[PDB]
């Protein structure tokens, strides 16, 4: 109802960092998601999997997580 369906995801600084990037241009969405699809493709494959929700913290700037060890 308004939730992230993919923890592993706030595990990922990575995201957050390309977070901002994306509410920039979301024509560089594919390319981002690209890069973590060699990285980890099985993580990658939980977000197309999960519920769709997830775009809302896709288009969500990042003021919450950051890694473990940082935060939004």
Known sequence: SGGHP???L???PQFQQMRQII???PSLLPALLQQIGR???QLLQQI???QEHFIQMLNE???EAGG????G
Request: no cysteine; glycine share 14%; net charge negative.
């Open 6 to 8: 993919l923890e592993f």
């Open 10 to 12: 706030r595990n990922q």
């Open 23 to 25: 509410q920039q241009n």
């Open 39 to 41: 990285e980890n493709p």
């Open 48 to 50: 197309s999997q999960h």
């Open 61 to 63: 700037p990042v003021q």
């Open 68 to 71: 473990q060890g940082g935060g």
